[model samples]
Target: WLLDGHLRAYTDDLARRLRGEPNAHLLHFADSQVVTMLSSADPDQQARAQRLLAGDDIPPIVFLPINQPNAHWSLLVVDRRNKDAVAAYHYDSMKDPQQRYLADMAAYHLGLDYQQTHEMPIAISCGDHVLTGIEVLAHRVLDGTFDYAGGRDLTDIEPDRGLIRDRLAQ
Candidate 1:
């Protein structure tokens, strides 16, 4: 499993890349920030979550990685622009129930319908998968290239350290 620091760095990099695109109104957050929003019961964290999205031009796509207590990582894509019934999609390589539960909590907090997609081949490449999935889906959704129905199953994605390194180098 990749460490939180690495995941955050990659996410920050990906966010930076997406931020450059004029058409991509995407918002990315740290895993810890998301954990606080979705899992914390403290009032302060709840307030923080509220403040995080209360104002400003809310983006169409919200991307964040979720770190399970068991050190597994999954990606949560909250697509506000999706025409489908559900707005939030959780992709877990292991398809772990615990991860889905957490993702559900996140969707509830965000006030969006939840859709879980965990058809990926089980492997230790979860962190990589999260990064790749985010990169692919974010651009596709922004460019109107994603086929919502068939593209939901992401089992074909292979972990590419080269791509991760390329993004980090930017």
Candidate 2:
């Protein structure tokens, strides 16, 4: 869904910006990247994955793009703020049975013990009508959003949701 495809590029760009800052090296798992490792037995951790998760000092955020069962797209934001309690939250239009598995897999690849759960669905965060919306969540991630419950995009939100939408349209 191109509607939601912007999420990956948008978030990856944000992660890159974050990388420009100190101690910021967030990992972005594209839509199909995580799917490939979802089925590896005994923690399908890779070499770079190990490098990203090895040190306990720096726990940068991990962004993974998920394609929902309803053919919609969403983002899995892994909060590494708490090393021990590493929580993963889903930013999505709707929930599906596969959400939990992703959390567990994330934990495995990252060598964490926390679980992944649906944090803020677009339905709840934005509203029911805009559940299928894309780029909105990533825009909100870079900065805070205000008074945006439902719509295709936000006007004055920080990190500029409008900028994301406009850039993606190209």
Candidate 3:
């Protein structure tokens, strides 16, 4: 697994290369179900993503805006190691856990939406290949690519090098 800084750097580089024409309008999804519902309109995306089933691959990254009860952009990338699974990393400034939960719930609903509409499995990979949501957030924060009000700085926290080293030693 990559560290937060490394992941951020990689994501930033990819973002630079993929930046291009925006979609007609931001997809406002009340839940993961909504995202699934919209997948049919763009079947090509699904086809391209299907290639991830192979063990050797370079996954594609997709950008989508989530604006409904709140506003934020989701930076999703394909996990090639695991049957081209969709990994959504949400970036937002809302610090409240309640608000975060609501957003997560909405994301879950969006996944369902994608599944129902596209006929694609919404199953995420299990074990080490799975990237944690927090890791994704850390990457977004470090890369300065996240869209947030007033922008938050995660590096402000002092690094606990010792703790990290200790964990490695174990």
Candidate 4:
């Protein structure tokens, strides 16, 4: 799902601090069947999602699990290809019967058409079981240190988790 107004503001603040530049990237968010499948396999995944949704000291970005019968995942993107940038988020579910039903309900609630599109959701999956949380998952990819689980920088992995927790605590 897309980041809410609060999350967008939080990400803008982070972007300002990290890049020393304005938040110009467009945030596009979506959900996928693949991520849902992964979350189904990981029990702790829901805890992270609940923490994020409960307004805990979580990161600005988050992933939510869709209760679909098939394997699927969700995708969120920060598109930076516009002049006057605007964040656009999307939600894509799997073509399963349950997902379709939920989508129908969501569309009806939001007054949207229940149409299926063939566009593939945008997401990059790094194969690490413990990095199940979307914020940590994406952060690992962006930081270029995603290979810690592959026996690379193993010593830093636990320390990194501690660091992440410490930061979140603040």
Candidate 5:
């Protein structure tokens, strides 16, 4: 509950300002839903999330906000259908290892369909921590691009180094 509130608020308000949901395919997975999905391969985390996310439609664009074991936060965005238009994105302000690992898990899940449809592989680590509800949004706002940012403001962070980067990015 601590982390689920902001970006949701961000998107909701954005929709309000636009007079309706933005002209985009936006589906938001709030708070616990994200962590649970990232760990979906495990039976334990899997069981609960399956039951919990029984209604999810798996939007083409997915947004995930991740929290560290100690409470640090990051973002992960999965663009299921944009292998050619945009490179896959992963953004962690601090580049934490555990966080990046978890984000990669979700990226693979989101990209599986896209991987087959197009020759251009979905290059993961699609972006920086756009997972922020306000801070990053705020920065994007002043760049003279609020409408564009809002359009791209789909739900979805991370940090890493060494070969792990090579493995995930391609």
Candidate 6:
């Protein structure tokens, strides 16, 4: 888990950078609010989720930070660049099977293909790992150098987490 304020701050900074020229792309970040709605089991919430994304035109790339009901965090990257198909990749620092299912379920709900990533080393920095993975995935995809099949690891240990702290402090 992570401080919502800190998470928002970091994402806000990243969003601004991604929006600039030479890096502009059709992308969307599903914050905790969106993720919670998408992960809800209640019919009303489910309806809200559908309404939230139902549109004539939606972003080709979506980054979702999945905050599980159990308080764990993970990442789901949905790529819809190809109108013919939708694909999703999951990243979890703890490598929990339950999170894998959750990702698959989310993908199913969004009519996406669940292409799970490789196993990650266990760590307590779930939120940080997700954020790092998001950064890597976003930039790499933009550069056309992202390896979807052999997904890169974004685990952040104490040192890396410290770097994130310094980053957010800015």
- The alpha-carbon deviation from the true structure for residue 52 of candidate 3, after best TM-score superposition, in angstroms, is 20
lDDT of 4 by residue, 1-170 (tens): 21233233433444444452222122112233323333343656644433333223333333333333334333222222331542222334225465444434332322234353222232221111122233443454456453364312222322244433343344
What lDDT does the true structure give each of the candidates? 0.65, 0.46, 0.32, 0.33, 0.43, 0.66
Cα lDDT tens digits for candidate 2, 1-170: 34344554554555554554433333333443443344345354454445544446434555555544445454555656666666556554454567555545655665665344545544442221222232344344445441244422332333344565665455
What is the per-residue lDDT of model 5 for residues 4-107, given as tens digits with 9 covering 90 to 100?
A: 44445544554344343343334334454555464666776755554443335644444466556545555654444444653334445454357666665554
Candidate 2 Cα RMSD (Å): 7.1
Model 3, total clashes = 16
Off by over 4 Å in 4: 1-65, 69-95, 116-170
What's every prediction's RMSD, in angstroms? 3.4, 7.1, 15.9, 12.9, 11.2, 3.4
Among all windows of ten consecutive residues in candidate 6, which has the lowest summed lDDT? 115-124
Candidate 6 Cα errors over 4 Å, as ranges: 113-124, 147-159
On TM-score, the stronger of 3 and 5 is 5
Candidate maximizing TM-score: 1
Report the lDDT tens digits of candidate 1 across residue range 1-170.
67777777887776776776755655555454545475578877876775564334556566667777546778776656554644556678774478777777776676665544333442236778888877777677657666567554566777798878776666
lDDT of 4: 0.33
Ten-residue region with minimum lDDT total, candidate 1: 115-124
Which candidate has the top score in lDDT?
A: 6
lDDT of 6 by residue, 11-128 (tens): 7778787775343466666665655676677988877775565344656677777776646778777767776765566667654478777777677667665654333443346778
Candidate 3, which segments miss by more than 4 Å at Cα? Answer: 1-60, 68-81, 112-170
- TM-scores vs. true structure, each candidate: 0.77, 0.51, 0.25, 0.26, 0.48, 0.76
Clashing pairs in 1: none
Q: RMSD in Å for candidate 4, one decimal?
A: 12.9
What is the Å distance of residue 139 in model 3 from its true position? 15
Weakest 10 consecutive residues of candidate 2 by summed lDDT:
125-134
